[PDB]
Design a protein around this nucleic acid. Structure first.
Lengths: 61, 49, 97, 22, 141, 63, 61, 61, 142, 243
RNA sequence: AAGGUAAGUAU
RNA sequence: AGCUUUGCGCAGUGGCAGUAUCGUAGCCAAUGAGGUCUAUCCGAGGCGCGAUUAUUGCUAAUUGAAAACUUUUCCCAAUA
């Protein structure tokens, strides 16, 4: 049901990397990590299945 | 039942635990006590008498 | 929630988890029982628990208990004043009081 | 016509509370 | 939040929805650091074991997995969504959005009731289930 | 009991018939005891005697 | 940092004190109130046609 | 039909197994299994499973 | 946990006294053989409870499951089935406003029970199969 | 839908307030051989119908005490002459004084008037009942058996039915005319369904039981559907059912 | 501005 | 030689109870289980866990099904 030890530890570190009001030294906003390529995603429409699929194919290097 | 009640009045000095809840009147808490029914009968008869 | 996350993160960071990852969940269970043992007003003394781990768990329990008491009293005063609150909030506050 | 229960502070104060009771 | 299983890419979410054939897949789209998401995730963790027989709970980071943001409108701080046999299940919550639960629920019993109702309706073949509680009002008095 | 149940499962023995007494006659044979009441009574009493017959037979053979 | 690996492994698993009757109690069947309660509520409201000579203000086919 | 014959054979094998006396001593059970050739343990079987296997072997044998 | 400890210690002390009255085991081999098992029993009593798995809620149930019927089922249905007085209880006359019966609860109402229109000339009797009686284990305490 | 007594399908709400009934709600219509005829209720040129207020239908404490003293002196006299004539009060002599005294004259004729004479300290016990039961008692100060019923809502309900236009005016708001019952006389409700009541004890889950406790509402909305489902009360677009 | 989307098979 | 006592199986008849029966290669227990009466006295199983429709089987209805639905390229709009 629950995550293994590695997953729990990794999730805790990822949460700590964002909540700098609890962890860390410097204090950024709640969701900021401080202190190209944009993935193409389907919009859920049957008319745009082909273009989204081809764009996913066209993004392979 | 009366014989059991008199026997409890004479010889019973130890009793089972009674549960406690709190009626929330939203201004304070009123304690509410749940006693065993077998002791409840004796206590009610004693109160009436 | 933030206190539990912070305590667990600290314990798992200092844990040499290269061999003992499976204890991580166990750690949280202790952080529950101790808290429960404080809420139940019963003694809590784990015999196999290392002294630094027990000390930090006690610090976590003390901080959570201070927050718990303050939150319970604040919510009770809100309800007494007439603050508009939910049924689940009322039940939880009644349990805390 | 709204059906909202209106306060009777100052409303229907002319009549006593013994009226319409037997 | 840090105890429930995590899905790290869109393909993993696809497989998680596809894999379960007799249990409702409950997926929380959001962020671990979001306070609303922390409340929702701690409620889910509280009821994670009790609903083992008829539900599986996963957590998806929308920033890490923005694959379903466009179609599922995953733009609220927290979102809980139910799937059954690879089929999104809608809930007549009374909030006007039947496609998802987009708020943190305090009581852990209400979430169990919602999951149970979703399971019953979906196993009966329905695509919409009427929740036992109407959420058009927070019942605050 | 398991021996009997598995014998009945595999068809070795016929499935057990309901045990019917006089007070039980209107619950097991109720619908057929309005059409031929005396035939039903005779069948029920024959079953009762056969149950008694086996008991006395076992007692006599064991004695 | 002073907790050794063997000490870390020596951490015990947390168990539950309460027994089967409290952890997983059997279903609490609800039953209707006995008919005698309807009968007794029905007895009340049946009034004598006469009063005792000593009663005061404070006590067919 | 041979299916009825084999079902009856299995049933009578089980019936005989229900009346075979087998020692409850684990050492004697292991010695008997060694004498009759079958392995002491099969897929992590317990002592009760070992007793059942010895009973089945003695029933077939 | 002190009455049980007192009983165990008294029994072991009686054993040790019976040993000593004959001046056997002068060094105290029997005394230590009993003291260490007393400590073992004390440790066993104070042992932490073991890990018990949480039982998940049963999956919601759909379909048909065959249930038996018989004397037990008949008795259960008679105890749980609707009674004539409890049948009249949940019937309210339409248009005939009745005076409030119970002061503490205005919701409570007898319905057709004791009120005209029920169609029963004679008063309904109490189904004695719905009698309230103590459990079997409560009989043991008595 | 609120102040209609529960016998007619309403909620039977008691109003300690000022609620006006619009005159448009006091109109009904019936069909006979000559066609359809329309009726109102307020013939007199008065204001809109005002529901009776639980204000006026309670006797004040001072008048209640004066009535109690007068009635109990009267009963003392009547008992004095009753003893002399070797007769007992036959519930007919005590007809002018029936629901008047603080220990209501009702209590003198109560069937269990002998066992209650040995009930002492009942008011203190009733007050202290709050520490044993988990529900607050609004009538913590009095006992119905010992002190009598110190209030009556017969006049209140009568005037509530009169103010709403009677049965004809009330039932025009309901689906009663859709049932085609010839009259309202020989009619009775069934509070719980034959099957709905059987499920109260069948081991249902919390979610399953919670949704089953809303079944009566599904009937209430059906009873007042011609009035709840209206364009005047719910402004906005309308959607017709698919069949 | 909303809290007013029946769902289900079929192309 | 009849009668008769106790324990134990095997049956037959009848009654009562279904908030309970059962399991123990888990632990503990007449070297004392467990103790509110009456304690220089009482004396037997308890505890934990597991199974369940609060013992478990068949038998027969009903429902859900199941068997099927044209399980086969539609529409808004464009031109000839």
């Amino acid at each position: 049901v629950y995550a293994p030890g590695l997953d729990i530890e990794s999730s805790l570190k990822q949460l700590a990397e964002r909540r700098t009001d609890i962890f860390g030294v410097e204090e950024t906003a709640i969701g900021k990590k401080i202190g190209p390529e944009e993935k193409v995603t389907w919009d859920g429409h049957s008319g745009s299945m082909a273009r989204t699929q081809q764009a996913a194919q066209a993004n392979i290097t | 039942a009366l014989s059991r009640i008199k026997r409890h009045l004479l010889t019973q000095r130890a009793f089972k635990e009674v549960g406690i809840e709190f009626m929330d009147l939203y201004s304070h808490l009123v304690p509410v006590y749940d006693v065993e029914p077998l002791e409840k009968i004796t206590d009610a008869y004693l109160d009436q008498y | 929630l933030e206190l539990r996350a912070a305590v667990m993160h600290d314990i798992l960071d200092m844990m040499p988890e290269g061999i003992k990852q499976n204890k991580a969940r166990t750690i949280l269970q202790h952080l529950s029982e101790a808290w429960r043992c404080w809420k139940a007003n019963i003694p809590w003394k784990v015999p196999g628990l290392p002294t630094p781990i027990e000390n930090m768990i006690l610090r976590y329990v003390k901080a959570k208990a201070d927050w718990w008491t303050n939150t319970a009293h604040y919510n009770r005063e809100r309800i007494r004043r007439g603050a508009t609150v939910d049924k689940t909030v009322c039940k939880k506050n009644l349990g805390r009081l | 016509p709204t059906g909202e229960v209106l306060s009777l502070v100052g409303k229907l104060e002319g009549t006593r509370m013994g009226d319409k009771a037997q | 939040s840090y105890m429930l299983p995590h899905l790290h890419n869109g393909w993993q979410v696809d497989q998680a929805i596809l894999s379960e054939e007799d249990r409702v897949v409950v997926i929380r789209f959001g962020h671990d650091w979001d306070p609303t998401c922390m409340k929702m995730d701690e409620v889910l963790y509280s009821i994670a074991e009790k609903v083992k027989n008829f539900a599986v709970i996963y957590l998806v980071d929308i920033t890490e997995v923005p694959d379903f943001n466009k179609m599922y409108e995953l733009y609220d701080p927290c979102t809980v969504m139910f799937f059954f046999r690879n089929k999104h299940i809608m809930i007549d919550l009374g909030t006007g959005n039947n496609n998802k639960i987009n708020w943190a629920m305090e009581d852990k019993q209400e979430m169990v009731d919602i999951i149970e109702t979703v399971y019953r309706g979906a196993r009966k073949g329905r695509g919409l289930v009427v929740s036992p509680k109407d959420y058009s009002t927070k019942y605050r008095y | 009991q398991k021996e009997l149940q598995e014998k009945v499962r595999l068809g070795l023995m016929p499935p057990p018939e309901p045990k019917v007494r006089i007070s039980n006659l209107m619950r097991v044979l109720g619908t057929e005891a309005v059409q031929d009441p005396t035939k039903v009574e005779a069948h029920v009493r024959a079953q009762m005697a056969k149950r008694q017959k086996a008991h006395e037979e076992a007692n006599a053979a064991r004695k | 940092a002073e907790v050794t690996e063997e000490e870390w492994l020596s951490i015990p698993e947390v168990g539950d004190a309460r027994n089967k009757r409290q952890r997983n109690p059997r279903y609490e069947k609800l039953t209707p109130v006995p008919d005698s309660f309807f009968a007794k509520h029905l007895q009340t409201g049946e009034n004598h046609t006469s009063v005792d000579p000593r009663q005061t203000q404070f006590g067919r086919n | 039909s041979e299916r009825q014959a084999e079902v009856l054979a299995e049933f009578e094998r089980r019936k005989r197994a229900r009346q075979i006396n087998v020692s409850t001593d684990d050492s004697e059970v292991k010695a008997c299994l060694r004498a009759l050739g079958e392995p002491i343990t099969l897929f992590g079987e317990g002592p009760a499973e070992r007793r059942e296997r010895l009973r089945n072997i003695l029933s077939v044998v | 946990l002190r009455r049980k400890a007192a009983r165990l210690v008294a029994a072991k002390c009686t054993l040790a006294a019976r040993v000593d009255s004959f001046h056997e085991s002068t060094e105290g081999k029997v005394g230590y053989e009993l003291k260490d098992e007393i400590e073992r029993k004390f440790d066993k009593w104070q042992e932490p409870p073991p890990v018990k798995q949480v039982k998940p809620l049963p999956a919601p149930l759909d379909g048909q499951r065959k249930k038996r019927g018989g004397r037990r089922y008949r008795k259960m249905k008679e105890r749980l089935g609707l009674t004539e007085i409890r049948k009249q209880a949940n019937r309210m006359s339409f248009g005939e406003i009745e005076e409030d019966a119970y002061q503490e609860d205005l919701g409570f109402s007898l319905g057709h029970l004791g009120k005209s229109g029920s169609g029963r000339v004679r008063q309904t009797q109490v189904n004695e199969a719905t009698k309230a009686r103590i459990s079997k284990t409560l009989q043991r305490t008595l | 839908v609120f102040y209609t007594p529960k016998e007619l399908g309403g909620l039977g709400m008691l109003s300690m307030g000022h609620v006006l009934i619009p005159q448009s709600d006091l109109r009904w219509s019936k069909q006979t051989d000559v066609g359809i005829t329309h009726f109102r209720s307020g013939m007199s040129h008065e204001e809109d119908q005002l529901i009776p207020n639980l204000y006026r239908y309670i006797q004040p404490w001072e008048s209640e005490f004066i009535d109690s003293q007068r009635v109990w002196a009267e009963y003392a006299l009547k008992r004095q002459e009753a003893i002399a004539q070797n007769r007992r009060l036959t519930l007919e002599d005590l007809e002018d004084s029936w629901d008047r005294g603080i220990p209501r004259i009702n209590t003198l004729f109560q069937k269990d008037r002998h066992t209650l004479a040995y009930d002492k300290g009942w008011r203190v016990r009733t007050d202290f009942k709050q520490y044993q039961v988990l529900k607050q008692n609004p009538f913590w100060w009095t006992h119905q058996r010992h002190d009598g019923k110190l209030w009556n809502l017969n006049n209140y309900r009568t005037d509530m039915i009169q103010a709403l236009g009677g049965v004809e005016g009330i039932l025009e708001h309901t689906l009663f005319k859709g049932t085609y019952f010839p009259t309202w006389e020989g009619l009775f409700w069934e509070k719980a369904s034959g099957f709905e009541e059987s499920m109260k004890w069948k081991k249902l889950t919390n979610a399953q039981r919670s949704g089953l406790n809303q079944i009566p509402n599904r009937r209430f909305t059906l009873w007042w559907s011609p009035t709840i489902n209206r364009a005047n009360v719910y402004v906005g677009f309308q959607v017709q059912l698919d069949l």
